[PDB]
Amino acid sequence: LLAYLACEKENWGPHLIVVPTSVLLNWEMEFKRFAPGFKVLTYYGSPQQ
DNA sequence: TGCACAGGATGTATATATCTGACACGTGCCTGGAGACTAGGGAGTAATCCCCTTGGCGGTTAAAACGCGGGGGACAGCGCGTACGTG
């Protein structure tokens, strides 16, 4: 659906997912596996990183 | 002539009468001791409601705890001289 929004319209936008802490890496690995052309960030190291 | 002696001329602690100072006793007018009336402030109670607990599982995060390197600062040793101790 997010890859459909990039090709259907010109809206890309900064998106947001809310994942549990155990499946945090599977969405990044799935984002590199499926639909590579998206820029994805993650969230680790709350006080410093 | 050199020498001991008897009595006076001054001292000196000793005992006695005398001068302050503080403890002890005998009063009386501003205090207390006590009797009665008032009453409002203190002792007692009936809901109340409201924030304050009761007990313990996990997940995760930010704070607390440990560990080593070493660098610079506490700290000991020692000579000087002038600044207060002593007369």
Curated annotation (Swiss-Prot):
It is found in: Nucleus. It comes from the Eukaryota. Belongs to the SNF2/RAD54 helicase family. SWR1 subfamily. Catalytic component of the SWR1 complex which mediates the ATP-dependent exchange of histone H2A for the H2A variant HZT1 leading to transcriptional regulation of selected genes by chromatin remodeling. Component of the SWR1 chromatin-remodeling complex composed of at least ACT1, ARP4, RVB1, RVB2, ARP6, YAF9, VPS71, VPS72, SWC3, SWC4, SWC5, SWC7 and SWR1, and perhaps BDF1. Present with 656 molecules/cell in log phase SD medium. This is Helicase SWR1. It comes from Saccharomyces cerevisiae (strain ATCC 204508 / S288c).
